[PDB]
Amino acid sequence: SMEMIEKAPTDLEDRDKAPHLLLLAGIQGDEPGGFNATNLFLMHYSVLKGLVEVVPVLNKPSMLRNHRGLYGDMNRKFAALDKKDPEYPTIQEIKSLIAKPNIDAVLHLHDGGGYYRPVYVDAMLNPKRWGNCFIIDQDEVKGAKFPNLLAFANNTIESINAHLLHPIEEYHLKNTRTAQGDTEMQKALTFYAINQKKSAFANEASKELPLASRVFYHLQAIEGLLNQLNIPFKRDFELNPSSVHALINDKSLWAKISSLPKIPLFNLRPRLNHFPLPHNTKIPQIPIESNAYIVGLVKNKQEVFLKYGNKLMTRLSPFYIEFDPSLEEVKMQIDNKDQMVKIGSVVEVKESFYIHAMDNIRANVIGFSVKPNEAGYTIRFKDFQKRFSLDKQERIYRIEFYKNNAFSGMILVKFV
Numbered sequence: 366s367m368e369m370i371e372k373a374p375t376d377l378e379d380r381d382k383a384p385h386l387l388l389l390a391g392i393q394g395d396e397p398g399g400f401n402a403t404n405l406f407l408m409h410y411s412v413l414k415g416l417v418e419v420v421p422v423l424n425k426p427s428m429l430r431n432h433r434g435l436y437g438d439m440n441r442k443f444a445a446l447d448k449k450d451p452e453y454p455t456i457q458e459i460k461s462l463i464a465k466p467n468i469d470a471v472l473h474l475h476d477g478g479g480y481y482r483p484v485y486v487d488a489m490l491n492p493k494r495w496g497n498c499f500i501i502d503q504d505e506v507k508g509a510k511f512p513n514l515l516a517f518a519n520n521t522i523e524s525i526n527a528h529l530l531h532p533i534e535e536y537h538l539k540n541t542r543t544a545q546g547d548t549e550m551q552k553a554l555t556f557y558a559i560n561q562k563k564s565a566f567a568n569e570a571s572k573e574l575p576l577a578s579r580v581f582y583h584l585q586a587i588e589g590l591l592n593q594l595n596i597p598f599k600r601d602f603e604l605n606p607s608s609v610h611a612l613i614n615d616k617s618l619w620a621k622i623s624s625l626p627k628i629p630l631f632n633l634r635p636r637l638n639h640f641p642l643p644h645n646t647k648i649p650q651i652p653i654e655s656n657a658y659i660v661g662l663v664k665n666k667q668e669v670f671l672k673y674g675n676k677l678m679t680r681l682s683p684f685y686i687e688f689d690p691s692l693e694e695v696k697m698q699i700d701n702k703d704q705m706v707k708i709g710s711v712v713e714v715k716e717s718f719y720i721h722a723m724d725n726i727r728a729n730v731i732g733f734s735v736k737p738n739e740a741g742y743t744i745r746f747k748d749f750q751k752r753f754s755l756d757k758q759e760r761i762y763r764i765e766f767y768k769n770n771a772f773s774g775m776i777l778v779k780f781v
């Protein structure tokens with residue numbers, strides 16, 4: 366259930382005019398620096414020549430459960446692997462992407478404990494820690510387009526260190542010299558990549574950092590490496606922790622569950638009651654769209670969680686029901702003007718609305734009261750019990766339609 370998303374030039378011919386990077390994160394589901402960085406890269410950057418292929422989260426089931434790895438460490442499955450391992454097919458997908466001739470370089474993002482130091486200082490600062498280092502398996506890979514891993518790493522590190530927020534965050538090189546006897550790294554992603562004659566790098570951001578600072582350093586590493594590869598790019602923001610925080614916490618982010626209307630990711634009430642979901646559909650099979658790339662649904666006890674990375678956006682208390690798709694649109698008066706409103710849209714209301722009755726369709730305006738049918742009522746903001754709003758701001762309300770005993774669809778009204 367991982368996806369690969371291309372970031373490419375608008376002109377297809379420009380793909381071959383610069384190198385190709387494979388950018389990967391989220392091989393651990395509890396390393397949000399990485400998969401929030403891949404998410405922001407996908408949402409807010411443009412690649413002008415060459416190609417950057419992105420797998421924003423490698424281990425999505427684990428991400429959804431805020432878990433390091435539900436089926437064990439996925440970054441130890443690139444060497445020997447039982448064919449019955451639940452992640453065997455995923456590993457083959459990842460290996461396939463890595464080994465494609467249209468890839469030159471691989472950058473794997475991680476969040477890691479403490480701060481790496483080449484010599485022991487204390488429990489947080491020592492060679493066994495992983496935070497804030499840029500990592501190679503060896504100094505060179507003969508036969509790669511760009512064999513000089515060490516030079517690339519050193520220059521990328523120099524780029525990152527020109528932008529430190531605090532001096533303790535200084536990046537260091539970590540060469541694991543994997544082929545020489547590092548049996549753990551021999552099982553990991555970048556070493557597989559090396560053996561396909563790809564330049565391969567990993568970037569670690571410290572888990573001791575706030576998410577926004579982790580993402581900041583991940584983006585510095587991505588940009589540093591893109592610069593070394595001479596892959597030209599643009600972003601639509603300034604790279605600082607404040608901007609990163611704002612883009613993670615972006616109020617324009619939405620989730621579209623099934624055929625329901627888009628709902629905002631942020632500032633939802635923490636629980637949405639009697640929430641219609643298609644019956645007889647396993648949760649991972651319920652379609653969900655977003656303008657972000659790390660959104661999904663996951664069962665928790667009797668609830669369905671809406672997740673944004675490791676962030677819990679709301680708890681759905683589901684109402685499982687057949688989704689009848691026959692109703693495409695509903696005639697509504699909005700602020701005096703009659704119009705046809707598509708099922709699954711959000712309509713802004715300044716003053717009032719009125720739903721026209723339909724023969725075999727019942728409308729329930731959630732938060733408005735008199736098998737309720739609430740078509741034929743002129744409804745204003747003052748008529749709502751505000752606690753039924755989707756949003757903390759008390760401005761967004763659900764209108765649900767039923768062709769009993771089936772669910773005919775939903776429309777949101779937003780009072781503006």
Ligand SMILES: N[C@H](CCC[C@H](N)C(=O)O)C(=O)O
Pocket residue numbers: 440473475477495500550553554555556566567
């Ligand atoms: N802290 C990571 C480092 C892996 C670095 C590189 N070998 C990769 O595959 O990403 C781990 O223990 O798996």
Ligand code: NA
Pocket residue numbers: 380381467
């Ligand atoms: Na190409």
Ligand SMILES: [Zn+2]
Pocket residue numbers: 408409601602
């Ligand atoms: Zn943007």
Ligand SMILES: [Zn+2]
Pocket residue numbers: 393396475476477
């Ligand atoms: Zn990791």
Ligand SMILES: [Zn+2]
Pocket residue numbers: 696704705
């Ligand atoms: Zn009409």
